[PDB]
Amino acid sequence: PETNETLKLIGSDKVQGTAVYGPDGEKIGSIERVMIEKVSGRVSYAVLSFGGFLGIGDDHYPLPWPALKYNVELGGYQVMVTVDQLERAPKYGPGSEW
Amino acid sequence: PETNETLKLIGSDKVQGTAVYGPDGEKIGSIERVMIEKVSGRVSYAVLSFGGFLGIGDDHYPLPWPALKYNVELGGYQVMVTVDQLERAP
Ligand SMILES: [Zn+2]
Ligand SMILES: [Zn+2]
Ligand SMILES: [Zn+2]
Ligand SMILES: [Zn+2]
Fold first, then answer.
1. Percentage helix, strand, coil, to 5, in chain B?
2. CATH class of A1-98
3. CA distance B6 to B22
4. Which chain B positions have a beta carbon within 8 Å of A38's beta carbon?
5. In chain B, where are the structural domains located?
6. Coil/strand/helix, residue B67
7. In CATH, what class is B1-90?
8. Angle at CA B5, nearest 5°, toward B3 and B8?
9. Residues from chain A contacting residue B37 (CB–CB below 8 Å)
10. How far apart are CA A24 and CA A46, in angstroms?
């Protein structure tokens, strides 16, 4: 009796660890977490982890929730992100002046 | 550079496993996951796992997001549910 997915709803423990593919269908990495607004409970952005391992030596690319299209064929999210964009991932979180 | 909490945002991976306490400050269970609306990105409810073990033998209680008040002293969410409510969990 653990449903972690419904027709309209998805569990954060299911989102976490889901493969993320680029336009070309190559795996870039996976979703490490979603960052949820403490007040409203709405997802601000999803954290795409890539390079190295989740939690160690990875980089992070933040994705708006709506950018995460689940591709049945690939069994994961597929996003519009290019190599150049990934290369220029922010060194600090999005909420930072730099 | 692994941060899972800021002033305004909490990471789903930190919310998961967070202790849940009742009005009297006694631990009921913990948050097992939140369920997010696929189309809006809004958290529909968080799943409170209580009794047995996380995922195995446990019971579930759905807590709307505003129902979760973080309590620094207790170190977890404090929620207003009674034992009789928990007993009639769907
Ligand atoms: Zn799915
Ligand atoms: Zn990471
Ligand atoms: Zn906190
Ligand atoms: Zn459970």
1. 15, 45, 40
2. mainly beta
3. 25
4. 8-10, 70
5. 1-90
6. helix
7. mainly beta
8. 135
9. 8-9
10. 21
